[PDB]
Design an enzyme around this catalytic site. Structure first.
Site, short mmCIF file in Angstrom:
data_model
loop_
_atom_site.label_atom_id
_atom_site.label_comp_id
_atom_site.label_asym_id
_atom_site.label_seq_id
_atom_site.Cartn_x
_atom_site.Cartn_y
_atom_site.Cartn_z
N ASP A 279 0.85 -1.18 0.00
CA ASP A 279 0.00 0.00 0.00
C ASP A 279 0.89 1.24 0.00
OD1 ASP A 279 -1.99 1.84 0.15
OD2 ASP A 279 -2.72 1.26 2.14
N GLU B 211 28.98 15.50 -1.17
CA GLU B 211 29.70 15.74 0.07
C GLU B 211 28.72 15.61 1.22
OE1 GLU B 211 30.90 19.73 -0.58
OE2 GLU B 211 32.52 19.22 -1.97
N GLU C 263 36.85 17.94 3.68
CA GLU C 263 36.40 19.05 2.86
C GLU C 263 36.65 20.37 3.58
OE1 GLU C 263 35.64 20.15 0.21
OE2 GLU C 263 35.03 18.54 -1.15
N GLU D 130 30.82 19.29 -16.43
CA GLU D 130 30.52 19.26 -15.01
C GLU D 130 29.54 20.37 -14.68
OE1 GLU D 130 33.69 20.36 -12.48
OE2 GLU D 130 32.57 19.96 -10.64
MN LIG Z 1 34.64 18.36 -3.33
#
Ligand SMILES: [Mn+2]
Ligand SMILES: [Mn+2]
Ligand SMILES: [Mn+2]
Lengths: 454, 453, 453, 226
Positions: A51, A128, A209, A352
């Site tokens: 469901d 990230e 990072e 990119e």
């Molecule tokens: Mn990066």
């Protein structure tokens, strides 16, 4: 890999359970578990009825159809479990549900094949994430609050710890990428990489990072569109579960903190036909005319894409000037949302797109990007000259409301070939508008800081 | 499985104890343990005398008669123990006690066989439950309180925890059904399923449910009426004990929290005679005329059934509009309390009654549903057209209404001697005591509303 | 007292503010304050415009019309303030708003005069209240709680207090009525009586009541219907504010505590025409045939009356058997909801209706009782013989039942235009909202009863 | 406007003296009503109310033109009458957001109070909030009304009876953009100067940028796990 191989695995690994997994519109993974003895040959032909009315945007019974090629052992459950990814099919025709993101991505790939432009599309995303030791948030009539705590947070330089404070922390915008003990996530990142390799991803790298409160990324190898969307779902699952098992908390929010770098998901794209990269040529940065048309389509439909690639109000906290916001292409300029990486071999030529963030639904985001590129190719939308050097330059949507309005007014490139249906787009827009309305209507502590005395 | 097989199991598993189990009127398992060496051939023919006067609704020397076919090893007790389910028989005639729920269910099955309508009745119940980390409740002259705490509770998004707060929690009405770490009961549910399979249940699936504070359900395969009632008792036992062993706390209350989804027990039903499903036919949604008559009987006696399928005041805090309260049948409408599931194989044709809750006594609830259906079949009660508005009947809006309707609508339960007037009266009084307690104790919401007025 | 006298008072007491007060449907006083210099002759002829859309049941620009005869100096405000009670009038026609309780009561009195049955109606209400030191209550998704604390509470016999615990407390159902230091509210009650007399009320007595946690009552002299409703509003205001000034907290809830006596408002009634009591006669207990007809009407419409005299769910936690729930009249029996007090003087002959509670809106409750009595008189409804058992009618057992009976029994209220269908519907919806809240919120007693089942 | 300044000063200081703290924020709490500043307006010449007439609700042609001007420049006005982001958490549907005039409709942002004496005829503009600068807000309202009168901007029929109905600005950014693009009616007669409007816009855009760029606890509640 097929049903016979799945049934062989069930005995090879002494599997007790099988976890049928799928993705909702918002991009969250939903799983239902069945005992291994319920998996037979008929299971792979008839699926499981469930469901779906309780799922977010599916409010109207549907079939979970396993995809045996996605079979993989779960490395976290105490009991031996096998993960099979499933598509949601209509109960009668056994056709893809209109609002199923995986079905939408598969239909986008099928449309790509049908148009004859190319045979395969390659996606490499670079998500990230943030790792925290504690997160507390709440809201009520009396106010609201959010409090992030991590041992790596620079603000903890004065905190008193049991056993003493050890000082070595990454400064704000200074976590890219010192050696331990300043970087305290080496072991966790390595274990994430190993688990991802077990689950079937190819890991290229992992590192800390820029941000201070444990921002990390694990870079994995590219793959075809739907396959890489499944890989992103596995990636997020692995990151979350490893962080939980290490006493941490992972988050893919685009912007959890102000004054520190946010989390983004740069999406590399390429098209191949008969094993030949179609984005390789003699034009700018070694691109081809097809590549330029793809860039032009992405630029034209960028605001509509934003509704799917940046589907949260928080995303536009990082998509602010000063995180690129300009809709232009350049191989060197870092203010361009679209970049052309410098690559040695033409076979690896790609574009990119940098504005997407990891909060996006992978299937829907990739499908939107591919459909915009295909519209650009079909209509021969030239993106202009490269931004190698200014209000004439278009920019990404400045708000989720703007992105949703543009998606509402710019549906054709998504409806080409039946990839997206008007009903699916409307459901997605309403589902996101609910969250946007909540954020819009709830007051803000910064608003108190600014306006309490005025 | 018989007495000889039980005596063999005693040596095979080095059993030290045998725990005789039975169900009271309210539906709670009562167990008395005897050492293994007290179990012999005479034990299975004469039973064990026990004093039932202290049981809830049995106030007036009865016999515990083991049912060897129910023998199963307890997976939780430190000492090797064997669980045997027992019926309560009158000491003299060795006939089923009129107020024993298991005896009532057995008599309902026997009546079904005698009427010639069908040989077997299949029941698939789908109970749900809540898992909590802490529950505190109390009442006195000075006030009353209830406080539920679970790590998955959305309200804990601001709580401070030792070792840090991990913010992955289900949202309100958002626990259906994201992957971990948002879902924190995967291991608990897997252990429940494995233990249930050890104890003789066939599991089909398990998952997190809509509510936030650890609502979960483990689905089990259908079975005959009395067998599936025993299976539901084993299910509740396993859930409670596994949750206790994991540091959690399981509850089958219909509605523990306001503003979040409650817990229900949808009851799938079908009738088979000579191995052919009698609910399969060419009528609506592949149903037969007997299926329609069964639906009509259930609809007609729905309020009386509610006294047994929803026997708690808390039950009628989930049976509120804005809902599975309309007494109509449809294959598509979510507002109909009776659904016809879409199943390809006619052998799987069935009707799903949605209003029951897991707080119900399994034996009594199943017997009431079966007897209402059989009354519908015998009297050829047509349920009308499928609901594909004020004239539509609804389930009882309160436990008092349900009990009054049961008092005024006893005949379909007294058919064939299944239910006895004394048993019905005892049940009604036993429930009216609880209803009176809840009716006479003041409410914190009442203070919030009326303290200043 | 007129506008000229109010203007004279403004200078006499150096009044700085005038507080215009009115009553909403639920029965809560609403006040808007204006500076004294805004009060002139034109003020008493044109009123003050205000937006009533935000009032409870007034959702669609109405006029506040001061009633100078109600002018009284506020004894609590720091600045010299004058309280004037106001009616709510439609801006155009300056006629009473259909949903204004005071207007409804005035129309009921006018209807009584028009029918010719009597000239005046006398009402003696006897409200009771609770005084507490601390009240804490709340509800959320995680649970709900209420906690009452008072120094007189018997449960504080073990509490540790700074400066020591003095153990003189009323026992449960034992506060009627020992001398101090067991009774700790003598000074509070005396201050309440003095302030009430300052505000124009005539006090007859004051004492501690049966319950333990500071239940008290101050008795006031009877008066005409609308006047006595205003007096009841002043009474509640004075009690609340005096308790606040003494560090206490007053509540007029029917039933704050379980196991201890609740608070009720017995309503004495009588009718007079040309200065002679019409309830005095040679019939039972010195009553007249008109008195018997009044009793019969009240009995017939008792359930509909309950929707207005017992308008809270908490009310029906005191209207429980083991009780003033039987709809019968007797001069000796404590089980009869209607009593005939033994009074030597025929001029004092009256009927005492016992079921009402102090949470009722005074205007609406008194109007309902009067209209039921007038219907009984007009239709000559004989109440039968005095109750000196299952056939005896009883008051409504729930607020839902009371509201349904009010919905189905509107005619005796709509007689003479006193109640309007729109007003009755608005009242019913406004009360049904609260009823739904209390019906859908789970109960701590429900957890105590059903958590393990 | 001076009286409003004295009002705010007195409220703040009395609240401080009583141990409380006062605020004129449009919306300090979610789920509960916000604070607004309904502005009643009327023009008089030689002691004669120019808003009294035989038109709708006893208004005059000048009153209707004033309403039309206010409606036309409502978004530009919002930059001054609702100069805080918090203001637009009060100006949300579910309302005072519809730019239409009526004497009965509660959804109309402009209302015509029912008053017996023609000398007291006026128009009530309901969207402004108390965080506004009184001088600038009143000046903007007056200038919009005067532009409406000068250009004879008819406001259309009253809203006594829906996407065609204009609405107030949905955000401070929208209000500031509309103020930037709609300067003429404020610059009429030298009242507002381009430099003043630019300084105001920059000053408010700083606050808007801070609020826009700071993450929200509701954003965490919604997106932490996604
Ligand atoms: Mn990066
Ligand atoms: Mn379920
Ligand atoms: Mn008394």
């Amino acid at each position: 890999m097929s049903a016979e191989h799945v049934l062989t695995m069930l005995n090879e690994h002494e599997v007790k359970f099988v976890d049928l997994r799928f993705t909702d519109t918002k991009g969250k993974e939903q799983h239902v578990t069945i005992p291994a003895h319920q998996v037979n040959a008929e299971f792979f032909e008839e699926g499981k009825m469930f469901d779906g009315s309780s799922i977010g945007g599916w409010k109207g019974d549907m079939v979970l159809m396993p995809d045996a090629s996605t079979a993989v052992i779960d490395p976290f459950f105490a009991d031996s479990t096998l993960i099979i990814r499933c598509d949601i099919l209509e109960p009668g025709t056994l056709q893809g549900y209109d609002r199923d993101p995986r079905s939408i991505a598969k239909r986008a790939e099928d449309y790509l094949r049908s148009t004859g432009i190319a045979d395969t599309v390659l996606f490499g995303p670079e998500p990230e994430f943030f790792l925290f030791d504690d997160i507390r948030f709440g809201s009520s009539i009396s106010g609201s609050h959010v409090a992030i705590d991590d041992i790596e947070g620079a603000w903890n330089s004065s905190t008193q710890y049991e056993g003493g404070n050890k000082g070595h922390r990454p400064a704000v915008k200074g976590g890219y990428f010192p050696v331990p003990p300043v970087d305290s996530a080496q072991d966790i990142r390595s274990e994430m990489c190993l688990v991802m390799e077990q689950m079937g991803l190819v890991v290229e790298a992992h590192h800390h990072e820029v941000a201070t409160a444990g921002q990390n990324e694990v870079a994995t190898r590219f793959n075809t569109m739907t396959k890489k969307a499944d890989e992103i779902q596995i990636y997020k699952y692995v990151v979350h579960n490893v962080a939980h098992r290490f006493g941490k908390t992972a988050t893919f929010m685009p912007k959890p903190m102000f004054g520190d770098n946010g989390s983004g998901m740069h999406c590399h794209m390429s098209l191949s036909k008969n094993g030949v990269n179609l984005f390789a040529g003699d034009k700018y940065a070694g691109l081809s005319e097809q590549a330029l048309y793809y860039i032009g389509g992405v630029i034209k439909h960028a605001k509509a894409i934003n509704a799917l690639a940046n589907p949260t109000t928080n995303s536009y906290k990082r998509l602010v000037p000063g995180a690129p916001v300009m809709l232009a292409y350049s191989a060197r300029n870092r203010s361009a949302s679209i970049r052309i990486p410098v690559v040695s071999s033409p076979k690896a030529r790609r574009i990119e797109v940098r504005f997407p963030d990891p909060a996006a639904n992978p299937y829907l985001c990739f499908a939107a990007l591919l459909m915009a590129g295909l519209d650009g190719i079909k209509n021969k939308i030239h993106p202009g000259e490269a931004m190698d050097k200014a209000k004439e330059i278009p920019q990404v949507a400045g708000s989720l409301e703007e992105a949703l309005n543009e998606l509402d007014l710019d549906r054709e490139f998504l409806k080409a070939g039946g990839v997206f249906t008007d009903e699916a787009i409307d459901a997605y827009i309403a589902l996101r508008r609910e969250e946007d309305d909540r954020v819009r209507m709830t007051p803000h502590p910064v608003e108190f800081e600014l306006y309490y005395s005025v």
